[PDB]
Amino acid sequence: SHMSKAFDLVVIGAGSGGLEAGWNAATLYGKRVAVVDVQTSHGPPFYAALGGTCVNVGCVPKKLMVTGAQYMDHLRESAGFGWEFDGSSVKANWKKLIAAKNEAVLDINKSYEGMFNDTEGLDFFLGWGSLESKNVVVVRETADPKSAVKERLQADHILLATGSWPQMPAIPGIEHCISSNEAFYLPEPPRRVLTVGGGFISVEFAGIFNAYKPPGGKVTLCYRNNLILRGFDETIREEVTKQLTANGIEIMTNENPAKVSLNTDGSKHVTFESGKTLDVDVVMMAIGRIPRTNDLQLGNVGVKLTPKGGVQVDEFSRTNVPNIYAIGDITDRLMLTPVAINEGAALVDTVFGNKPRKTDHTRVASAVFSIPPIGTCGLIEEVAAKEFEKVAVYMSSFTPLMHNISGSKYKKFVAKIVTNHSDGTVLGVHLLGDGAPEIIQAVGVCLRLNAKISDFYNTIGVHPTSAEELCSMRTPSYYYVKGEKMEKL
Amino acid sequence: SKAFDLVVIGAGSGGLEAGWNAATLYGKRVAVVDVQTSHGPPFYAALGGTCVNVGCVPKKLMVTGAQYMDHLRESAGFGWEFDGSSVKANWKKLIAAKNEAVLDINKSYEGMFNDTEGLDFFLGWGSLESKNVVVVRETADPKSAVKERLQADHILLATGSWPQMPAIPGIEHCISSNEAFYLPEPPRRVLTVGGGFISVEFAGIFNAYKPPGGKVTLCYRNNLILRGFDETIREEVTKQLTANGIEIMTNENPAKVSLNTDGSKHVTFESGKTLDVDVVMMAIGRIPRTNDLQLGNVGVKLTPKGGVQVDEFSRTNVPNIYAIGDITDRLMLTPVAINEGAALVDTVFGNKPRKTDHTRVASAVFSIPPIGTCGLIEEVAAKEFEKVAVYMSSFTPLMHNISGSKYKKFVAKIVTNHSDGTVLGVHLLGDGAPEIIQAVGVCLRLNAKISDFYNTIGVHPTSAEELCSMRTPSYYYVKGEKMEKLP
Numbered sequence: 001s002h003m004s005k006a007f008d009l010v011v012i013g014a015g016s017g018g019l020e021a022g023w024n025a026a027t028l029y030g031k032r033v034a035v036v037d038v039q040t041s042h043g044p045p046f047y048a049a050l051g052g053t054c055v056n057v058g059c060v061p062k063k064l065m066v067t068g069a070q071y072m073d074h075l076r077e078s079a080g081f082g083w084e085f086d087g088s089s090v091k092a093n094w095k096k097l098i099a100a101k102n103e104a105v106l107d108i109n110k111s112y113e114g115m116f117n118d119t120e121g122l123d124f125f126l127g128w129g130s131l132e133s134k135n136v137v138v139v140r141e142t143a144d145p146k147s148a149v150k151e152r153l154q155a156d157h158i159l160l161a162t163g164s165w166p167q168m169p170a171i172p173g174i175e176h177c178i179s180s181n182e183a184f185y186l187p188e189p190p191r192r193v194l195t196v197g198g199g200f201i202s203v204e205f206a207g208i209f210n211a212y213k214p215p216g217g218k219v220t221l222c223y224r225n226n227l228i229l230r231g232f233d234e235t236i237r238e239e240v241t242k243q244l245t246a247n248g249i250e251i252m253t254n255e256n257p258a259k260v261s262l263n264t265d266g267s268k269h270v271t272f273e274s275g276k277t278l279d280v281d282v283v284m285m286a287i288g289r290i291p292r293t294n295d296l297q298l299g300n301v302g303v304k305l306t307p308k309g310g311v312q313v314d315e316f317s318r319t320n321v322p323n324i325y326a327i328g329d330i331t332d333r334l335m336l337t338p339v340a341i342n343e344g345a346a347l348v349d350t351v352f353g354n355k356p357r358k359t360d361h362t363r364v365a366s367a368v369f370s371i372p373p374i375g376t377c378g379l380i381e382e383v384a385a386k387e388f389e390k391v392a393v394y395m396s397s398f399t400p401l402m403h404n405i406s407g408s409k410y411k412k413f414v415a416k417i418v419t420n421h422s423d424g425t426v427l428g429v430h431l432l433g434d435g436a437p438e439i440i441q442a443v444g445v446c447l448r449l450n451a452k453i454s455d456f457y458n459t460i461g462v463h464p465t466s467a468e469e470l471c472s473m474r475t476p477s478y479y480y481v482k483g484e485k486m487e488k489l
Numbered sequence: 490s491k492a493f494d495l496v497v498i499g500a501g502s503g504g505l506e507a508g509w510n511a512a513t514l515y516g517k518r519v520a521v522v523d524v525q526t527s528h529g530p531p532f533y534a535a536l537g538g539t540c541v542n543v544g545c546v547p548k549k550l551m552v553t554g555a556q557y558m559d560h561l562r563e564s565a566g567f568g569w570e571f572d573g574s575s576v577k578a579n580w581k582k583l584i585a586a587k588n589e590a591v592l593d594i595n596k597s598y599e600g601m602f603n604d605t606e607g608l609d610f611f612l613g614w615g616s617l618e619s620k621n622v623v624v625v626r627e628t629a630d631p632k633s634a635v636k637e638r639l640q641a642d643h644i645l646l647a648t649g650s651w652p653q654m655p656a657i658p659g660i661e662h663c664i665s666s667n668e669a670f671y672l673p674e675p676p677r678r679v680l681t682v683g684g685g686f687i688s689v690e691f692a693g694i695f696n697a698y699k700p701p702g703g704k705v706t707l708c709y710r711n712n713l714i715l716r717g718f719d720e721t722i723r724e725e726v727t728k729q730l731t732a733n734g735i736e737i738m739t740n741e742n743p744a745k746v747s748l749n750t751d752g753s754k755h756v757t758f759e760s761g762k763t764l765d766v767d768v769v770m771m772a773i774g775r776i777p778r779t780n781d782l783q784l785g786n787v788g789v790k791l792t793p794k795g796g797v798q799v800d801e802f803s804r805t806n807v808p809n810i811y812a813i814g815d816i817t818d819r820l821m822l823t824p825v826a827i828n829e830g831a832a833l834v835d836t837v838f839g840n841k842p843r844k845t846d847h848t849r850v851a852s853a854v855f856s857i858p859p860i861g862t863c864g865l866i867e868e869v870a871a872k873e874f875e876k877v878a879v880y881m882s883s884f885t886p887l888m889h890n891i892s893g894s895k896y897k898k899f900v901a902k903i904v905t906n907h908s909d910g911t912v913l914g915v916h917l918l919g920d921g922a923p924e925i926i927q928a929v930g931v932c933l934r935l936n937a938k939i940s941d942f943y944n945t946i947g948v949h950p951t952s953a954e955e956l957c958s959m960r961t962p963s964y965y966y967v968k969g970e971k972m973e974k975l976p
């Protein structure tokens with residue numbers, strides 16, 4: 001019919017945070033929920049869709065594609081264990097990878113769609129949502145607030161959960177460049193590619209492209225500062241740089257693209273600020289992600305933005321307008337799917353259950369699917385050392401024995417535990433090597449239970465594994481004392 | 490002749506830890522006896538123990554090696570193309586690379602002895618001459634020539650364990666794990682006998698390296714392999730072994746073995762069935778190695794099954810005589826023997842009594858795919874707690890829908906005391922499981938409840954996060970009885 005529909009909760013953006021909120025409110029609490037997204041399945045023109053950034057063009061397809069990339073290491077490393085086969089026959093078929101990923105993703109899209117069609121009180125609306133007033137969300141045909149109205153949805157409570165978007169720098173020839181969004185759909189793997197950025201996406205893609213490159217290919221990563229993966233453990237930052245270099249990736253630090261132009265053959269010609277040049281078939285920018293707040297017409301209700309650009313929120317995800325909340329990357333804090341999900345669950349417990357609950361943003365475990373991957377939870381030592389008078393660092397680094405037979409001698413596993421040495425409390429744990437993302441998960445539970453180094457040391461090791469290293473350290477390699485590093489007290 | 494604070498019989502997992510800790514932490518004078526300096530025939534274990542020479546260390550390399558049979562197949566799902574007809578598994582290369590790694594550790598360990606004050610290695614066979622004297626002889630025979638008499642304040646028994654070989658006719662045409670480590674050729678047809686981890690691990694090893702037309706059979710006298718591990722996991726690992734071409738013969742037991750004219754083995758089971766294979770590997774058990782020690786010289790008591798009786802501080806019935814590791818016939822794991830060794834040394838030579846905790850010890854089976862476990866299985870929990878909840882997740886991860894190994898179900902189970910949420914055990918089957926489970930070991934040392942798991946933020950995408958996404962039991966045990974709803 002031609003009438004608006006009414007809800008307890010309207011959620012704009014059917015992604016990690018919004019889906020957790022909406023499912024919880026409808027199924028745990030009997031609320032009537034509407035959820036809006038721009039697309040029912042992944043890909044061009046809008047990339048993200050039902051299921052969010054993670055399902056469509058994020059965690060899920062990238063993990064698949066890293067898993068694909070790892071077979072290059074596997075097929076080579078097999079020879080050290082006796083495997084023999086015609087090495088000259090090996091090809092990496094990118095198009096098969098992409099078609100397999102696309103169908104996996106589309107199956108989640110269809111699955112999610114089916115759940116909306118079926119679940120009472122939980123409704124999907126296709127289009128672009130924005131705030132018309134504090135109790136009405138309008139759903140339009142495009143992100144232009146002048147496009148046609150498909151629905152008006154009344155809402156007692158409104159959740160903003162539109163996520164983030166790739167930031168593109170304002171350089172000449174930026175139009176010749178792509179983001180991670182387009183990278184997922186490249187018709188063919190680039191012979192030569194530049195990945196611009198030192199963060200997890202650049203690095204992860206650098207390893208994907210490096211395994212699927214055609215014959216005379218070359219992957220280059222550039223970063224404007226001097227060491228990639230700011231925010232992660234420094235030892236690990238240096239080591240993953242070496243290991244990426246060891247597998248044929250050229251890391252360019254202290255380099256930033258100044259312009260891009262097309263060569264007469266149509267390749268991209270990149271000029272760096274230093275006047276170095278590089279010719280490539282693809283330039284993928286991954287220099288950052290920014291909150292998606294522009295299309296919500298927040299000025300219509302006066303929802304405040306932080307100096308930085310995220311929707312401002314309190315610890316309860318509340319904006320300055322009482323019944324309007326924000327969760328996920330739109331708050332511009334930790335841009336991780338399970339953080340968005342925890343925030344959603346906790347919002348809905350607080351507002352609709354009788355159960356106030358704030359997300360804990362500390363001691364969050366995360367991973368980088370570099371090759372080999374990082375697993376990390378809690379504080380890096382230089383941050384810990386500014387908060388706590390005495391810090392101890394327990395460190396074990398070693399090429400594991402499998403990799404002395406596989407040939408990949410450069411694959412050094414690193415395990416570090418950072419403590420408040422005043423009481424043993426584990427402040428952070430940082431891992432580099434095969435299995436690190438899997439090892440770190442239950443370490444997150446330890447940290448939430450305020451584990452001490454002796455709790456780890458007293459646990460009996462599972463042997464032989466990499467993880468047992470965390471249960472074998474009782475003497476600090478070094479310390480920080482009122483901020484200064486020294487091998488002894 | 491010669492005087493020591495500590496004489497350790499067996500340079501193995503427990504014995505080395507104890508010997509190291511006594512010499513370097515307490516500045517004691519230590520002698521350590523073992524029968525061989527380097528791995529391999531004739532005594533198999535050597536300096537380093539069973540783990541280093543014919544156990545954890547080389548078995549893991551070999552299972553790593555076997556995993557490629559899967560990785561090579563599964564690469565195709567992700568686009569990888571190559572001539573599969575060209576693929577062959579070179580067992581001899583694997584064996585050589587393994588031998589080299591093990592040999593390096595043997596040498597390294599020798600270097601360590603050579604450079605460590607108060608830590609001496611003696612080659613030979615040790616036994617108890619009297620309450621304070623360890624005789625070191627030429628051979629296992631207690632009548633063979635004396636090489637040494639070591640006087641000792643304190644004597645450590647740490648000679649480990651040995652494969653149990655049943656007394657069936659033709660048992661001498663069978664091998665054990667010791668021999669499996671050195672086979673010249675990968676066996677084309679093989680029978681592994683036994684339901685425990687060593688049988689299962691070797692079954693997956695031989696399965697990957699068998700020549701064309703090959704075939705691994707695993708047999709087990711009872712109805713389901715891997716007793717002691719979680720039941721769902723036992724059933725699922727059986728399915729996953731069968732999917733990868735291993736034939737699992739349950740309720741079958743060899744009654745005899747004969748030699749065929751081609752040098753193969755003819756097996757007859759108790760049921761009358763028969764099977765011809767090239768190698769029959771008996772892995773039905775491992776028994777405490779107490780026989781050459783001459784414990785009767787001083788009257789150290791054995792328990793009924795044959796381990797050296799110990800108290801919780803590793804003390805035998807005779808003052809200043811201790812036993813740790815497999816010889817005590819408890820948990821036969823390397824980190825458990827190390828921990829015993831350490832705790833014993835701190836008690837005897839240090840200011841503080843310390844006893845090893847044998848509960849909530851994390852462990853793995855390097856089956857393909859592998860198991861990780863820590864703490865109680867639900868049937869054991871249900872005889873000791875009135876109200877037990879089980880939380881279970883089981884699904885083929887997406888990566889294995891693409892790889893084409895659709896049979897590879899990941900299983901995560903968490904078993905709780907439902908009266909207060911205390912996690913009593915966690916049980917995993919799937920790639921990464923032994924890695925996942927280590928930090929769960931630490932969790933169980935922190936009174937972790939199911940809600941502590943559940944309120945922790947996942948790392949995505951991993952198999953592990955599955956342990957932080959369960960808050961609703963799948964079923965219960967109330968007063969020992971399995972049901973799906975609580976009263």
Ligand SMILES: Cc1cc2nc3c(=O)[nH]c(=O)nc-3n(C[C@H](O)[C@H](O)[C@H](O)COP(=O)(O)OP(=O)(O)OC[C@H]3O[C@@H](n4cnc5c(N)ncnc54)[C@H](O)[C@@H]3O)c2cc1C
Nearest residue numbers: 013015016017052053058059129162163328329335336337
């Ligand atoms: C390449 C890449 C790899 C990643 N890998 C990981 C990883 O491995 N692990 C991890 O934890 N995190 C990963 N992330 C980050 C993760 O994807 C995000 O943190 C998470 O998806 C954010 O959840 P959200 O609810 O804020 O938004 P999203 O999941 O991004 O959902 C926002 C939704 O809003 C829709 N939308 C936008 N504007 C409107 C509008 N006006 N109207 C209606 N709908 C709208 C979008 O179409 C989208 O579906 C990755 C991200 C990227 C880009």
Ligand SMILES: Cc1cc2nc3c(=O)[nH]c(=O)nc-3n(C[C@H](O)[C@H](O)[C@H](O)COP(=O)(O)OP(=O)(O)OC[C@H]3O[C@@H](n4cnc5c(N)ncnc54)[C@H](O)[C@@H]3O)c2cc1C
Nearest residue numbers: 499501502503538539540545615648649814815821822823
């Ligand atoms: C095939 C196999 C795989 C295994 N895999 C694992 C695994 O993955 N993880 C794990 O945790 N555990 C594993 N184990 C178990 C592990 O090897 C044992 O629990 C561990 O080695 C026990 O150490 P120990 O100190 O009791 O004795 P051991 O390490 O066996 O050492 C005892 C030593 O005493 C010597 N010795 C014996 N008699 C005499 C004598 N009278 N005089 C002088 N020396 C003597 C022996 O040569 C031997 O080196 C495995 C065992 C086997 C057989």
Ligand SMILES: CC1=Nc2ccc(Cl)cc2[C@H](c2ccccc2)N1CCN1CCN(C(=O)c2ccco2)CC1
Nearest residue numbers: 015016017019020022023024051052055112115116341
């Ligand atoms: C809880 C939940 N959180 C999400 C968080 C982020 C994303 Cl991207 C997706 C979900 C997912 C979801 C999918 C579709 C609509 C809402 C929520 N989702 C629902 C998943 N759901 C699990 C339980 N389920 C049941 O039917 C059920 C409920 C109770 C016992 O079984 C079907 C699928």
Ligand SMILES: CC1=Nc2ccc(Cl)cc2[C@H](c2ccccc2)N1CCN1CCN(C(=O)c2ccco2)CC1
Nearest residue numbers: 475501502503505506508509537538541598601602827
């Ligand atoms: C402690 C220890 N326990 C063992 C338990 C079981 C085995 Cl099978 C081997 C060891 C090993 C050892 C090897 C040789 C003789 C005695 C002990 N050993 C010493 C090996 N050690 C590794 C680390 N190391 C250190 O000095 C050290 C300790 C803490 C930080 O660095 C040098 C040698």
Ligand SMILES: [Cl-]
Nearest residue numbers: 092093094095
């Ligand atoms: Cl291709």
Ligand SMILES: [Cl-]
Nearest residue numbers: 197198223224
């Ligand atoms: Cl940059």
Ligand SMILES: [Cl-]
Nearest residue numbers: 225226227230
């Ligand atoms: Cl820097």
Ligand SMILES: [Cl-]
Nearest residue numbers: 578579580581
């Ligand atoms: Cl061979």
Ligand SMILES: [Cl-]
Nearest residue numbers: 683709710773
């Ligand atoms: Cl049996």
Ligand SMILES: [Cl-]
Nearest residue numbers: 711712713716
């Ligand atoms: Cl049984």
Ligand code: NA
Nearest residue numbers: 116119122123
């Ligand atoms: Na509905």
Ligand code: NA
Nearest residue numbers: 457459460471
């Ligand atoms: Na330990």
Ligand code: NA
Nearest residue numbers: 602603605608
């Ligand atoms: Na010495």
Ligand code: NA
Nearest residue numbers: 943945946957
């Ligand atoms: Na959780």
